[PDB]
Design a protein around this ligand. Structure first.
Ligand SMILES: *[C@@H](C)[C@H]1/C(=C/c2[nH]c(/C=C3N=C(/C=C4\NC(=O)C(CC)=C4C)C(C)=C\3CCC(=O)O)c(CCC(=O)O)c2C)NC(=O)[C@@H]1C
Ligand SMILES: *[C@@H](C)[C@H]1/C(=C/c2[nH]c(/C=C3N=C(/C=C4\NC(=O)C(CC)=C4C)C(C)=C\3CCC(=O)O)c(CCC(=O)O)c2C)NC(=O)[C@@H]1C
Ligand SMILES: *[C@H](C)[C@H]1/C(=C/c2[nH]c(/C=C3N=C(/C=C4\NC(=O)C(CC)=C4C)C(C)=C\3CCC(=O)O)c(CCC(=O)O)c2C)NC(=O)[C@@H]1C
Ligand SMILES: *[C@H](C)[C@H]1/C(=C/c2[nH]c(/C=C3N=C(/C=C4\NC(=O)C(CC)=C4C)C(C)=C\3CCC(=O)O)c(CCC(=O)O)c2C)NC(=O)[C@@H]1C
Ligand SMILES: *[C@H](C)[C@H]1/C(=C/c2[nH]c(/C=C3N=C(/C=C4\NC(=O)C(CC)=C4C)C(C)=C\3CCC(=O)O)c(CCC(=O)O)c2C)NC(=O)[C@@H]1C
Ligand SMILES: *[C@H](C)[C@H]1/C(=C/c2[nH]c(/C=C3N=C(/C=C4\NC(=O)C(CC)=C4C)C(C)=C\3CCC(=O)O)c(CCC(=O)O)c2C)NC(=O)[C@@H]1C
Ligand SMILES: *[C@H](C)[C@H]1/C(=C/c2[nH]c(/C=C3N=C(/C=C4\NC(=O)C(CC)=C4C)C(C)=C\3CCC(=O)O)c(CCC(=O)O)c2C)NC(=O)[C@@H]1C
Ligand SMILES: *[C@H](C)[C@H]1/C(=C/c2[nH]c(/C=C3N=C(/C=C4\NC(=O)C(CC)=C4C)C(C)=C\3CCC(=O)O)c(CCC(=O)O)c2C)NC(=O)[C@@H]1C
Ligand SMILES: *[C@H](C)[C@H]1/C(=C/c2[nH]c(/C=C3N=C(/C=C4\NC(=O)C(CC)=C4C)C(C)=C\3CCC(=O)O)c(CCC(=O)O)c2C)NC(=O)[C@@H]1C
Ligand SMILES: *[C@H](C)[C@H]1/C(=C/c2[nH]c(/C=C3N=C(/C=C4\NC(=O)C(CC)=C4C)C(C)=C\3CCC(=O)O)c(CCC(=O)O)c2C)NC(=O)[C@@H]1C
Lengths: 67, 160, 161, 100, 48, 161, 160, 161, 161, 160, 161
């Protein structure tokens, strides 16, 4: 379905959480294409740095058959 | 191990392994001699225990060894003996460790999927483990029998 | 995660054989060490915050790290350092109690280096704080338990390096 | 004051917000190495999303791929929750038989 | 819930009536009834 | 929900029997309906926005309903009314292509009267909207297809009232 | 019903039926005559179909009726046959309806729970359904054989 | 929610007319009151904590509610009352600053009755605490600002009743 | 939810009094029963599936409920009934281990009758199934532990009736 | 209590209690005797504990009982002693329960907010609890001193 | 309604069995308590007007309810309070004599909540008045016999909550 895999480092800017937090502070996930824009907007607004992103699944510029 | 389970729980709660768990670890480490001794007992008598367990299981469920059943062939029966040997060794591992984490990480997670892919009657396997537990309880002495029976019927319930 | 007990059990299980004399020797050695391990863990639990206090005081306080321009500047970053040192102390205690430094690998060092590089945390200052924590814990819990904690703390600092 | 008879005692023992607010667990997938913890979190996610364990409502688990991806750590628990939501079973259970 | 916590039942204080609505939602077992606990909020002031 | 086919299936199954002659003739009647229903659904999907547009233009449009005081005032409430009409039209098409009102009364009548009362909605104006929907659909689908569509829309109106 | 199936699938996206769904509804409504015909052809042979299928399965897997077995008793043999009859009614329902939805909603969902609770072998019941399908294909017309074997195949694969 | 100005706007727009002389007079009256409203709101925001503290001291402390078993027992519940009184005072200030008590019955009274009934909150005790807050704020801010604040707080009390 | 210890503590707190002789005696009684409850819970955990299987076989098979028309027909409904019985067994074991029925009251009984009436399931058949589970559990656990489980199971039946 | 915590965890996981949790419950039941002894000691020495605790606290912080202080008057001092009695009762509850859960749920959630609303020095309340701990440790055995001091330190840290 | 005897009889009749030893024991317990119940009932009947007099004096007099505009203003309304308190006392005496608080549910709490909510009667103020009644009656008839009266008045208060 032309998913995206992203590595993003999201710091904590308001709260000092006392339990382990690498799993959500520095993570690489697989994001669907439709939700990629919303996810990236959310990450930037939360203040994380998008270290890397790549179209792991799908083919670039597919004029048809992208699902 | 009991220490590993306590560490996991304390980490989940962001704790320092409170005295209610530290005393338990202390008691386990002090009493480990009995657990070790039960370990050598089961290791020494593994062959016989597996043999009577298989005998009782076949008596209760002869169909599994029947040609229609999975255990027929004199090699499927050997494979049942082998799986009982694995389960006995796992129970020994759990007894020496102090908790069921090695038990579930070796032979309980996905056991249903394994026995479905092999066609095996997992409930029959649970009955076989019950027979193994009864044989071991008869072979050992009371409190040791209950200590092993904790892991045994844990495996029984998980298999069921 | 694996302790000494789980390491022995895995060494036996990879060969798929019941425990033998060597396994019993390893298990009884760990059982002998368990008394010291539990006592050191209990004392560190009792006075963990204090240990971080002296470690940070003698390692980073009144320095460029805490001064403006240093990564320990601002109350948020200072609290982040305090919590990170609490992390290191707690996980070192976990590793000491278990007898194996695998919890540090799969729960501390897993992405810690990359996270520190991305966020700008100074690895050298973190290592110095780790050494200070090791010294304080050794002086507080004695010689044998001190070395036991120090080996895991050095493991963490090397993994950071 | 007063004698505080048994009816009042029982009533006042459960007075404000129910104790369920604190008598609960939160499943945070701290590490994917613990396969047992991962499985427990997945089952809890199923329970929260569908209100039930999905044994008597499925021919077979269709979320096996999502479980494998989560255990491999290539998606987060939020992605797992989104996948559970965007499921045929969810629309069967809570979307099909109710108005919008 | 963040990127790692499975969602859980919440007990919010605000906004208004959210606590009673969530209470009515969560105090009933699955498929208990087909009625709507909160079909909509009757606005106090009607535009136009 | 259910349609005629699933109705005969589960009516047989509840008694735990195979398909008797009554079920066979019911299924034959539904199959005979068949292509007529599918054609009506296709034409409705063609002019989906049309029927709602001219239904509004006939009944609601240019009136006190769309004037101040009337519930149609403001573009937000106007588009909400249009969205409601689109819901009603899609459910009508679904019920037509299925052969039963189970889809509607499971996805429409549940709490709809009370929610519209909470919003102070004009039930009469809504009923007139569905009526205009009915004539506009009939004028595009024919006589019998339009008649069955109007029957389903009338069931919707009765549930709404 | 394929009608309700496509209806639900379209409602998931909140839109009318697509050309593919409407075309398949065209085909189903047109072929409903042959569908009902296969309905009678399978509903008329119910006694012989189940008798032959169960009889063949009994020597396919004798363990079902072997001592200590799942259906060793006469009563349990009859109960297994009655399950065969239920599943044949369900397949008749599905073939008439043109969709596996009646199968799923009646006798497939939670069936693994059913047969683990009762200990019956899922692989054996799948083999029984396969025997039913083979006998039905033998005793019905060729095209009707394929049409009914499609749904027999679905139930066999899904349950197994 | 509606304020003194949008109230006039909606009152005109329900009939759809423009803003006549009466509407301008109402807006000018609100603008005249705006100075007092702003001053009272600023003072109330400055002394919010002390007002609720004094009202609690003179209306709830040293009574059955605060005694063991009472609803004010269990310090979490005491903090809950402190927060609830803060909410009531802040939303009363909102209503006074707006000139219309629509926010009170929208964002405050919505579900409050059933909330307190489910939680077993003493409704009359809460009402009495609200009049205590009303008296304290009236004394703190004066006669006219106290007048308006008491009007809105007593509207909240009547909603609770 | 609350075990015996927490129930005693909360009752004493609501009276605002320390743990007197009666409370101490009740806590000692619970402590004495603790080993029994632990062993019974372990046994029921070992034989949970078998208990429900045998109870269903001896109580709810080859009857109208299992037959079409009965609410246990179809794999879906039969699995729902089996899961209901499993829930009853597990929560009864929880109540036995905690020495109190508050967990059943807040996690089981609340809305159970309402949902059963909504879905038309046989409350009488459910009660009989709970009975059969009671005899199976009593046989597996023993006499006194059997009675302790049975009192909670009968409480579940009384609430559900 | 450990019983309630384990039940909550098991119900959240939708499973029966594990052997480790059952062993923890067994250890808790075994230690119940000593916990009851400690709770009875504190309850018997109740009025003493509050009296010397309040006296030492006022000696250390005379301003709180001085004019203008939160606890100047005799009624205010009685209210301090009432709060101290509350916290001693909570500590006895926690000692009985084996966990800090009753203390935290009764008088530690929002304690900072409540004392800020009342204008009470939270550090002074912490010193009061410290004085109570000193009195109890003085009039209690050494090991029981540490056992109760765990809960006292928990309350003190919550105050701070 | 119901009492202790009727409760035992209904408990036996729901399962249709005769009276076993437990039922006779419960009846004997009620007969033993009968002398105390009759004593308390006669005393409360003799001093009914007084009890409400001091309850009103120590719970409601000289307060907002009695002040002009208060719900207890307007002497007809004061007499209504006197009559309502007398009703509560009489029906609480009924419940005490019967041994079962079902007469309160089916003859006092039936619609009383809705009555007070529609009438603007302060529920918490009424509860405080009933508590004062409980204290006065407890002091009048002793601690033991007053315990039952307190239990039933507390039942009334909880139902009115
Ligand atoms: C001296 C020891 C310190 C001190 C105490 C102090 N407290 C109050 C008043 C109250 N204390 C409480 C506390 C609680 N209520 C609970 O339910 C709980 C446990 C669950 C606690 C801890 C409450 C509610 C009050 C006020 C209401 C009431 O008393 O019923 C006072 C008097 C305050 C006043 O002005 O009235 C005092 C003096 N104050 C100090 O300065 C010392 C540090
Ligand atoms: C001296 C003139 C006589 C007298 C009067 C007296 N009255 C009270 C107490 C109360 N009087 C009322 C009366 C009213 N409340 C109303 O709403 C109306 C409508 C106008 C009336 C007439 C009330 C309600 C009370 C009690 C409550 C309150 O005062 O707020 C007293 C005091 C009695 C006591 O015990 O407090 C007295 C002395 N008494 C006499 O003996 C003179 C004949
Ligand atoms: C302190 C002596 C040094 C220092 C530290 C520092 N760290 C952060 C932020 C984070 N630190 C971590 C690390 C961990 N989280 C964990 O859960 C664990 C394993 C269990 C570790 C090791 C993380 C994840 C963050 C970011 C997210 C968070 O804080 O929750 C900061 C703040 C950086 C910022 O501004 O965001 C600081 C200052 N910095 C120094 O200069 C010291 C050498
Ligand atoms: C015997 C009473 C029951 C039974 C067992 C059975 N198992 C197999 C084959 C395999 N078992 C495994 C795996 C495991 N067995 C274990 O005990 C564990 C320890 C954790 C594991 C992982 C595997 C992988 C096989 C097949 C390959 C291999 O043996 O290495 C058989 C043979 C099946 C066949 O057809 O080959 C049998 C008979 N089956 C029953 O019906 C009994 C109830
Ligand atoms: C305090 C003087 C009185 C009292 C109150 C009390 N309330 C709660 C809990 C809640 N209160 C509310 C109310 C609101 N939330 C809102 O957003 C609005 C808009 C202003 C209102 C009115 C809610 C929703 C709750 C529950 C959720 C939550 O508490 O977070 C409590 C504590 C309940 C508990 O169990 O913690 C208390 C004590 N009780 C009295 O006895 C006083 C008369
Ligand atoms: C079997 C032929 C060989 C084998 C398999 C094996 N795989 C894993 C673990 C994983 N496999 C996958 C792959 C997928 N997950 C998916 O969802 C899909 C897409 C639909 C694929 C292809 C993943 C992601 C994992 C890790 C997470 C998980 O559990 O799924 C293991 C276990 C590894 C471990 O240590 O846990 C094994 C054993 N092993 C062999 O020896 C065969 C040659
Ligand atoms: C004129 C600048 C442009 C234009 C206008 C146009 N509008 C209509 C019809 C309607 N317009 C509205 C709009 C509103 N009603 C409201 O209450 C609100 C907010 C107060 C709005 C925005 C409505 C409701 C109608 C329908 C009739 C009615 O009001 O009752 C038409 C005629 C449409 C028709 O088919 O009759 C036209 C032409 N058209 C342009 O091209 C201009 C750019
Ligand atoms: C328009 C045809 C008539 C009308 C109605 C009207 N409706 C709303 C608002 C809503 N309508 C609904 C109804 C539904 N939602 C669903 O999902 C379903 C089934 C698919 C139905 C029947 C809902 C839920 C709302 C509120 C949420 C939303 O906006 O979507 C309004 C506006 C009310 C308001 O207070 O703003 C109106 C006016 N009014 C007429 O005059 C027409 C005859
Ligand atoms: C026969 C091919 C296989 C087999 C069957 C078998 N089944 C049972 C018992 C039951 N089977 C069911 C299943 C259903 N009942 C329904 O109404 C439906 C829904 C349409 C289904 C799927 C049930 C409910 C039972 C028990 C209760 C009842 O009979 O109504 C048995 C006997 C179990 C017993 O212990 O009594 C058997 C033998 N067994 C095989 O080995 C074959 C592969
Ligand atoms: C079995 C002994 C009897 C029986 C059971 C049965 N129940 C349902 C459906 C539901 N039962 C419940 C009840 C609970 N769910 C819970 O999580 C708990 C909390 C402790 C309880 C008490 C609920 C909520 C449902 C509906 C949701 C669900 O998916 O189960 C069914 C199926 C009803 C249906 O229409 O699907 C059945 C069959 N039926 C009998 O005939 C037996 C006597």
């Amino acid at each position: 379905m032309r998913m995206f895999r992203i590595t993003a480092c999201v710091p904590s800017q308001t709260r000092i959480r006392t339990q382990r937090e690498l799993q959500n502070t520095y993570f690489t996930k697989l994001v669907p294409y439709d939700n990629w824009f919303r996810e990236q907007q959310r990450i930037m607004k939360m203040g994380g740095k998008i270290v890397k992103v790549e179209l792991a699944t799908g083919r670039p510029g597919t004029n048809a058959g992208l699902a | 191990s009991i220490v590993t389970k306590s560490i996991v729980n304390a980490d989940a709660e962001a704790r320092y392994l409170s005295p209610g768990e530290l005393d338990r670890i202390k008691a386990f480490v002090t009493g480990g001699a009995a657990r070790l001794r039960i370990a050598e007992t089961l290791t020494g008598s593994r062959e016989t225990i597996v043999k009577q367990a298989g005998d009782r299981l076949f008596q209760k469920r002869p169909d599994i060894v029947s040609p229609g059943g999975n255990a027929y062939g004199e090699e499927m029966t050997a494979t049942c003996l082998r799986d009982m040997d694995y389960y006995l060794r796992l129970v020994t591992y759990g007894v020496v460790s102090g908790d069921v984490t090695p038990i579930e990480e070796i032979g309980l997670v996905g056991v249903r999927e394994m026995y479905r892919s092999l066609g095996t009657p997992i409930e029959a396997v649970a009955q076989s483990v019950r027979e193994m537990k009864e044989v071991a309880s008869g072979l050992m002495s009371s409190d040791d029998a209950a200590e092993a029976s904790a892991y045994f019927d844990f495996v029984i319930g998980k298999m069921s | 995660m694996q302790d000494a007990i789980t390491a022995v059990i895995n060494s036996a299980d990879v060969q798929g054989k019941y425990l033998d004399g060597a396994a019993m020797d390893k298990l009884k050695s760990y059982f002998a060490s368990g008394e010291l391990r539990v006592r050191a863990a209990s004392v560190i639990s009792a006075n963990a915050a204090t240990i971080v206090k002296e470690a940070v005081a003698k390692s980073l306080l009144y320095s460029d790290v805490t001064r403006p321009g240093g990564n320990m500047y601002t109350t948020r970053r200072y609290a982040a350092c305090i919590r990170d040192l609490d992390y290191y102390l707690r996980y070192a205690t976990y590793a000491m109690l278990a007898g194996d430094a695998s919890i540090l690998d799969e729960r501390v060092l897993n992405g810690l280096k990359e996270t520190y590089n991305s966020l700008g945390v100074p690895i050298s200052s973190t290592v110095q704080a780790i050494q200070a924590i090791k010294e304080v814990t050794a002086s507080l819990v004695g010689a044998d338990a001190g070395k036991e904690m120090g080996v895991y703390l050095d493991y963490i600092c090397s993994g950071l390096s | 004051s007063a004698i505080r008879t048994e009816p009042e005692i029982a009533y006042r023992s459960n007075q404000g917000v129910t104790r369920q607010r604190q008598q609960t667990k939160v499943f945070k997938l701290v590490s994917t190495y613990d396969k047992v913890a991962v499985k427990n979190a997945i089952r809890a996610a199923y329970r929260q999303v569908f209100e039930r364990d999905l044994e008597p409502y499925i021919i077979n688990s269709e979320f096996t791929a999502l479980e494998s991806k989560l255990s491999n750590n290539e998606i987060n628990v939020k992605e797992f929750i989104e996948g559970l939501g965007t499921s045929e079973l969810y629309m069967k259970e809570f979307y099909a038989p109710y108005p919008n | 819930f963040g990127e790692d916590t499975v969602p859980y039942r919440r007990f919010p204080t605000l906004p208004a009536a959210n606590f009673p609505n969530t209470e009515r939602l969560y105090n009933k077992l699955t498929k208990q009834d087909k009625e709507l606990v909160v079909p909509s909020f009757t606005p106090v002031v009607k535009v136009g």
